[PDB]
Design a protein around this ligand. Structure first.
Ligand SMILES: CC(=O)N[C@@H]1[C@@H](O[C@@H]2O[C@H](CO)[C@H](O)[C@H](O)[C@H]2O)[C@H](O)[C@@H](CO)O[C@H]1O
Ligand SMILES: [Ca+2]
Ligand SMILES: [Ca+2]
Ligand SMILES: [Cl-]
Length: 218
C-alpha cells in the first residue's frame, strides 16, 4: 500500500495557524565558480546550514508560500527582494543567496491519499511525519533530528519530485521544509493534490498549523 506517516493530536486551544520560519545567511565565495558549493555537502542540511548565522524568523506562515523568481538579470551577486506576504516577513532578503527552514504541522481537510509535488532552484528537502520530520509538540528541540528525506529536489538534475502519503483528517503531521538558493534565480514550489483531485494547488490556507511545545506528544 501507500506510505502512512505518523501524526499528532492536540486540544484546539493549543493550536494556532501557520508555520515557523528561520532564515539563515548563505554567502557567495566572492562577489563580482562564484557560488558556494557547501549546500551540496551531506552534513549541511543537518548542521552546516546554521554556520553562517541566521538573519530573520517569522511565525504564522500560512497560505501561498511558493514562488518562482526568474526575473533577476545578474548572477554572482546579492539581489534584494521580498518573500511572499504569506511569510509575515516585511524586510527584503538576499533572495539570490539564503537558506530557510519552514516547520510546523500539516492537517488534511479529509482522510485519504495526498500527493505532494516540489520544484526547486536550488535545493529543497521535504520531511514529513512524527518519525521523519520531528517529534509531536517538541519541534524546537527535535527540528534537526529528521530522517531520510521524503523528497530531495536539487537543481539542475533532480529539480522535480513527487511523493504520496495517506493521511487522516484528525491528525496534525510534523512537516519540515528546507530551502536553499546558492545564486541567482530562486524557485520554491511546493504543491499538492488532495484526494480524488487532478488539479494541483499551491495554496495551503487551512492546512498549516502549530501546536504548543510541551514535550509530551500533546
Ligand atoms: C555562476 C552563475 O551565475 N552562472 C549562471 C547561471 O546561474 C545559475 O542559474 C540557475 C538557473 O538557471 C540556478 O539558479 C543556479 O543556482 C545559478 O547558479 C545562469 O542561469 C546563467 C544565465 O545567464 O548565467 C550563468 O553564468
Ligand atoms: Ca526560529
Ligand atoms: Ca539559484
Ligand atoms: Cl512518520
Amino acid at each position: 500500500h501507500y506510505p502512512r506517516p505518523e501524526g499528532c493530536s492536540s486540544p484546539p486551544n493549543a493550536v494556532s495557524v501557520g508555520l515557523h520560519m528561520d532564515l539563515y545567511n548563505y554567502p557567495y565565495l566572492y562577489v563580482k565558480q562564484c557560488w558556494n558549493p557547501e549546500y551540496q555537502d551531506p552534513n549541511f542540511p543537518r548542521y552546516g546550514y546554521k554556520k553562517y548565522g541566521s538573519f530573520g524568523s517569522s511565525d504564522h506562515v500560512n497560505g501561498k508560500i511558493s514562488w518562482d523568481h526568474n526575473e533577476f538579470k545578474e548572477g554572482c551577486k546579492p539581489i534584494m527582494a521580498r518573500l511572499p506576504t504569506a511569510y509575515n516577513y516585511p524586510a527584503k532578503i538576499t533572495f539570490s543567496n539564503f537558506t530557510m527552514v519552514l516547520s510546523g504541522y500539516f492537517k488534511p481537510k479529509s482522510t485519504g491519499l495526498y500527493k505532494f509535488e516540489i520544484h526547486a532552484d536550488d535545493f529543497i528537502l521535504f520531511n514529513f511525519g512524527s518519525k521523519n520530520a520531528f517529534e509531536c509538540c517538541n519541534r524546537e528541540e527535535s527540528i534537526d533530528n529528521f530522517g531520510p528525506y521524503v523528497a530531495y529536489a536539487m537543481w539542475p538534475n533532480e529539480a522535480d519530485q513527487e511523493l504520496e502519503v495517506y493521511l487522516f483528517e484528525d491528525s496534525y503531521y510534523p512537516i519540515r521544509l528546507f530551502y536553499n538558493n546558492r545564486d541567482y534565480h530562486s524557485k520554491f514550489m511546493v504543491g499538492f493534490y488532495p484526494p480524488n483531485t487532478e488539479e494541483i494547488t499551491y495554496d495551503f490556507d487551512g492546512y498549516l498549523y502549530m501546536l504548543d511545545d510541551t514535550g509530551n506528544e500533546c
